[PDB]
Design a protein around this nucleic acid. Sequence first.
DNA 1: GGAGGCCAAGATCTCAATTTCGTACAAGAAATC
DNA 2: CCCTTCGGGAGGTGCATCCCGGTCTCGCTTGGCCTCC
Lengths: 235, 104, 342, 343
Amino acid sequence: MLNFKPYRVIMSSLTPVVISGIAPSLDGILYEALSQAIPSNEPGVVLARLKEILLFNDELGVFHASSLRFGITPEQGIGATTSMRCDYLSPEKLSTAMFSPRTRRGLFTRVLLTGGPTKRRMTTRPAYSAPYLTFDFVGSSEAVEILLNHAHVGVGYDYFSAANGEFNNVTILPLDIDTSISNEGMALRPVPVNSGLNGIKGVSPLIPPYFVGEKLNIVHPAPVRTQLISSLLRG
Amino acid sequence: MKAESLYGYLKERGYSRTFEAVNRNIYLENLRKVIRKAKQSVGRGIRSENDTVRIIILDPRFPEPTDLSSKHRSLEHIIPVRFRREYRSCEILSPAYFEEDIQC
Amino acid sequence: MRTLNFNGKISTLEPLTVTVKNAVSTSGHRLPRNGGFNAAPYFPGTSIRGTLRHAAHKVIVDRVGLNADGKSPFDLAEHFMLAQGVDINGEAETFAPGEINAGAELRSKNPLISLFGRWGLSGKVGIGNAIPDGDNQWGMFGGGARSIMFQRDESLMEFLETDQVDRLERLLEEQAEASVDISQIKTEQDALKKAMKSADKDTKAELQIKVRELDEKIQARKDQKQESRESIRRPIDPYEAFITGAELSHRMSIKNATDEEAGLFISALIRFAAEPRFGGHANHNCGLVEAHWTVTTWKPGELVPVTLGEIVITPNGVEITGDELFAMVKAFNENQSFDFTA
Amino acid sequence: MRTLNFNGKISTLEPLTVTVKNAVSTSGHRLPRNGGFNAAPYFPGTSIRGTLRHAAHKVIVDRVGLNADGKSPFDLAEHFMLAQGVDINGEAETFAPGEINAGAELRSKNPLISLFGRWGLSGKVGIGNAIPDGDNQWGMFGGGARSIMFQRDESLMEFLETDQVDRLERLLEEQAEASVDISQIKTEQDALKKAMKSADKDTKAELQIKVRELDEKIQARKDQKQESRESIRRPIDPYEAFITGAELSHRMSIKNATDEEAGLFISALIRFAAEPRFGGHANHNCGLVEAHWTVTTWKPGELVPVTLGEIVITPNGVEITGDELFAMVKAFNENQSFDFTAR
DNA sequence: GGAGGCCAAGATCTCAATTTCGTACAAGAAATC
DNA sequence: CCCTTCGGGAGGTGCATCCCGGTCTCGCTTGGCCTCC
């Protein structure tokens, strides 16, 4: 419970952003940041404390936190890059000092890295590498700024593990019109189907975390949205 | 020589950082001194709550509002937080060509 | 249970390079850049995360020690569970999907699997990327040429017996003639890549396979060398690294943390400081880093960072600062009920 | 099995230089740069590592002994294996990934390969770049100009018969005419090199092909010089080098160094001290260096490393302090279980 | 005689080439060790 | 206590190299075969 203003947050993307089908919502980033800030993972309490720094639409059941929208400058644009996570079974990893290989005549059975459950998993994921990441939200600038600057949260998939979509130089600029939920009838974040907002149909929980809770039908924006950084800083 | 001599300090005190690293550290320290000095300069502007100042920064290197990746972006901190909105909406004497690029 | 954010700088002692398939292309070895060539490279957080997971695994191995037989108690299944979190023998607790705070028993008993997760158990350590602070903090390091030893030092020919000096002469002859042949084939290949640009798609169904058969001819010619399969006089391609003494901003975090998990992480950092190497090209001593991490935590309830200490890893030593970090390390050293096996 | 970090300084006795194909361009000869044109030049770790690898190869050759004539028992393939890690036979045992203790036997029986590695076998030795200390400390050395011997001193001309004197006359006239023609062609080529900047990719292409055929015209003009293909009198392009007395901070590591492997490395440093030459332009005595290293080991899990000793290489000798380095050298020297010969 | 491990075989293919450069000053007070 | 001097003339040319030689891989299962339990 605190006075909440429409803010647009623009940050410099330092690593490619991996989008999990639905565009990463700023409310999910803030939920992770709060889960880190209050050392408790329970969705209920973290949500309860997220409402104190984000406006929550009760009649619509969503947080006023627009989805990810890439800010592209005339010099750098939205690009297609691959976030590549590859097993590195080093010789030091592959050594008797760390484990006891099954032996046959004093020879150690080599790990079959080619295939099988012990393979060198070369997982490639689509990632988007734009110069800037932008979100819009109706909230307290102070708390969200502190969280995004100091909480270990990125934009996209598994920022903890893959370090995807890391950002720095978080800049918050106040907006004149609330562009978090709706904009000329185009949904700017996951919103329920019945809201009358048009976009792309999908299945996902409305409130974060977006990997627990019944996946009800929702309308969400285009996963990859691009705007000129000048158009975004115009306000 | 501050960079060189400070490098001598770190070298003889055992710290291993190359001379170019000390050059960078000295550069960043000086740039933060420049930020403080320019903040003082802008503070000259307004002293009374009724003061109205038209600040004209004629340096080309002062970051443009649209250039969030500009090299001297920290200089944007010179403007007080409260007056950052007029910083974003500021008349540019000699701006740099923008366009209507269809790939927006 | 505290979220520990290690916000800090990595100063590079020897150039820091990493090979990523997407970043590296035929044009040369380039760092991950997140954009065009003019973009700013970043050292992946994946490489640092894997290196620190390996360090933590080694810390766990040392703490466990060896059996009476002098063999690590870990088998291949446990080793791959601790090292890369892949269950090979399909014997792992498949936690239900919708409880976030699941596996508390495994987290308590196994702090390595707690910090760095397994498949199906979210890890607690988010290791962010080492972002360079500057604009010209990368460079094409390495590079050179694998020089024929006997064409540089003539004295080394006094060791070769004549039946091997003629072998060397044959090797140089074969290298030279195979290399002009491969050069001609490459000249045809690039001429064909020029011709691709005037594609009308009547020829293209043939041109790409023609290119492929030229590559096959190249491989055949390399196979034809009787004395040496690969040319020795190779100009080594440079690899893109972060300059020596590059100040890279690094953000690492542990999520809600029992004293034991944070202690294990700090011990992993203390063991990584023995060989502070990130990335490959270790032949050129690449990866040697020294980093100062300011360990901040969040005040209970309040949104403010309190500084609990600093982890200054340097060639001269590891300076753990802050009584609370020492308390975490001591907690990890004690609490010997950890059961890393399965 | 200790991780020895040699941290030290390479003082320069004569200019330290290296020509790396990537760094040098048509603008001239430039030292390998620490990430940018306006960067501190660094001596590549590659050159130091190769010099030390050849020093260690010579150490192993002398240790294995020389036959009556002076030939080592190693064949050519073994020498290439030891010095450059290239197997010409292809019999070198490729370690399929996933092989536990990959090359532990080869490492035990081949200390040199264990140190400097191979294809698919990690080299325990990492030889880092030598970065300079302090601004400047690099400059354009060499330079000057090859000069016609007989136009500098006429006393060398009394040693030539009349036919040879007329041969020199023809050589000089040919050089002058070729210089004039090539200079005209190069002025046209330079007009094209200015025209580059309007690099419309198609005009860039045609202009580049025009520069190519102008180069072929130059080569053909020089091919029609009966007496001398190359101009005898010509300015020597300077090479960038680290000045004499330059201090270059250097870091080397031996990861998991057995006493035998570290003893071999120290013996390689000892033998390198005999000819402590790094880089090229050795005709100008470039590369001579005196280097002092502090060897520090770091038992993993301990907050501080312990200094085993110090290796100082100077023109007056190699000073080794610390009993540990002596014990390692003696352990390497007194082990007879190194089958350096290929399997 | 069954159970591990090493090694060869299996269909064609999908794509894109940067071209170095920071920063250029003033003075507050003084019983200084 | 005096009183610090004017000026003169600043190059001419050469020649700017030749050449190497640019790698293996590998992210999968599967059975055939070869040795051990």
